[PDB]
């Protein structure tokens, strides 16, 4: 509070603005359908990016 210093609310966890701006809030418009070649590269990137996240059971 103002100067009585009495805890009167709990606020969400502190992330400083500089790193909160780093979240990709507005997704970019680039699909794999706009990537020529790189099919092997795309599969390799997926085997590290999405396969562990989507299914860690394997």
């Amino acid at each position: 509070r103002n100067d009585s210093y009495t805890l009167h609310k709990i606020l969400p966890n502190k992330v400083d603005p500089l790193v909160s701006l780093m979240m990709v809030e507005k997704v970019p418009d680039s699909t794999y359908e706009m990537i020529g070649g790189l099919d092997k590269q795309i599969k390799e990137i997926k085997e590290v990016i999405e396969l562990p996240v989507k299914h860690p059971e394997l």
Partner: protein
């Protein structure tokens, strides 16, 4: 002083094949966890204990007021007044009220002060600013000396430095040698330094304080040395303790004539760390362990024999250590019988422990590529060059 910390749960891994022996063991663990939960729940369900003193406590609180700002007792004067520095840094000559434990006032202890008309109104022995609290290990890492392959000499030296004194130290003063205050791990990256630190923190009986090295540096002037001082004060306060400062070259680099205020503050932080490392006696039960890859770039005063006597070398794993590491990291795998694993170990390379782990992971991925999980030898064969990226042929033949 109080005692150490870092409680961990049971090793289990007595089996690892999920042959229901794991199931009885984890069932015993979960059942006893339920017992703890039920006991504490039912305790707080019926636990009437409050008031008692009340009115005396009520009036001492009324004298204390609200809020009460914590300060650092920098100096004491005749036993009614003292010098206390507020967390801003400004220090005042204040009075000490009657109800404070004069035995507890000691330069450095956090003292509760009245918000208006500053006055010592209480003593906090557990300030422990959130940074140093975070730097303390609570859940010990799951790795263990069984997980480390090779490094027998390294494990042996690290245990002689930071296990033997905490356990029976009678040999040390029987032989008249002081225990080694501080050890430093060095070698090429991914050789087992941080892994050995995890293993030590697992089979430990002392407070383990993990430090990033670069974490000690702070933006505000005087926050760096203050943080180092508080960290080591916690280490002594929770003795016996182990202070692990990973990547010591983040601050341990060559000392040079500072010009900028930031460089001066970095030099001051290192000077405070070195003075603190000198401060506690080697007979004391607080040991420091620092790891780095660029050993040559360290200050040759941080590694003085009077300060950090031991120096554990972590060479790239040999063929026998490579095969031990491969046995360890393929233990969980459902390897086919055709895999030999000796061709990869043969190949004269700079495979590290991390490189072997990555080779195993890539071999598993390649097995998944063929829809199988049995992981043949061909998967390892391709995985080796898949991971190992990057003498002109017939020069040295």
């Amino acid at each position: 002083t109080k005692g150490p910390d870092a409680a961990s749960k049971l090793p289990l891994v007595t089996p690892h094949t999920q042959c229901r022996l794991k199931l009885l063991k984890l069932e015993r663990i979960k059942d006893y966890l339920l017992m703890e939960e039920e006991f504490i729940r039912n305790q707080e369900q019926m636990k009437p204990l409050e008031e008692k003193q009340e009115e005396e406590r009520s009036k001492v609180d009324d004298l204390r007021g609200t809020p009460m700002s914590v300060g650092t007792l920098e100096e004491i004067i005749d036993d009614n007044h003292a010098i206390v520095s507020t967390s801003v840094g400004s220090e005042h000559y204040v009075s000490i009220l009657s109800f404070v434990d004069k035995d507890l006032l000691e330069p450095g202890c956090s003292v509760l002060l009245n918000h208006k008309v500053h006055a010592v109104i209480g003593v906090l022995m557990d300030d422990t600013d959130p940074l140093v609290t975070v730097m303390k290990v609570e859940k010990a890492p799951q790795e263990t000396y069984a997980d480390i392959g090779g490094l027998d000499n390294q494990i042996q030296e690290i245990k002689e430095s930071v296990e033997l004194p905490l356990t029976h130290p009678e040999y040390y003063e029987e032989m008249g040698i002081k225990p080694p205050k501080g050890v430093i791990l060095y070698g090429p990256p991914g050789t087992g330094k941080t892994l050995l630190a995890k293993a030590v923190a697992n089979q430990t009986s002392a407070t383990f304080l993990r430090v990033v090295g670069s974490e000690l540096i702070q933006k505000y002037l005087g926050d760096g040395p203050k943080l180092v001082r508080e960290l080591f004060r916690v280490a002594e306060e929770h003795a016996p303790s182990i202070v692990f400062i990973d990547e010591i070259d983040a601050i341990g680099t060559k000392r040079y004539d500072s010009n900028s205020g930031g460089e001066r503050e970095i030099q001051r932080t290192m000077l405070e760390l070195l003075n603190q490392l000198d401060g506690f006696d080697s007979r004391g039960d607080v040991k420091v362990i620092m790891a780095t890859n660029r050993i040559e770039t360290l200050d040759p005063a941080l590694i003085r024999p009077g300060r950090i006597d031991r120096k554990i070398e972590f060479p790239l794993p040999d063929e026998k250590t490579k095969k031990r590491i491969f046995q360890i990291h393929t233990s969980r795998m459902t390897l086919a019988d055709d895999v030999t694993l000796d061709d990869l170990i043969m190949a004269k390379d700079d495979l590290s422990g991390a490189d072997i782990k990555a080779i195993c992971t890539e071999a598993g991925l390649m097995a998944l590529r063929e829809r199988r999980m049995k992981v043949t030898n061909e998967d390892f064969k391709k995985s080796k060059e898949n991971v190992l990226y990057k003498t002109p042929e017939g020069l040295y033949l």
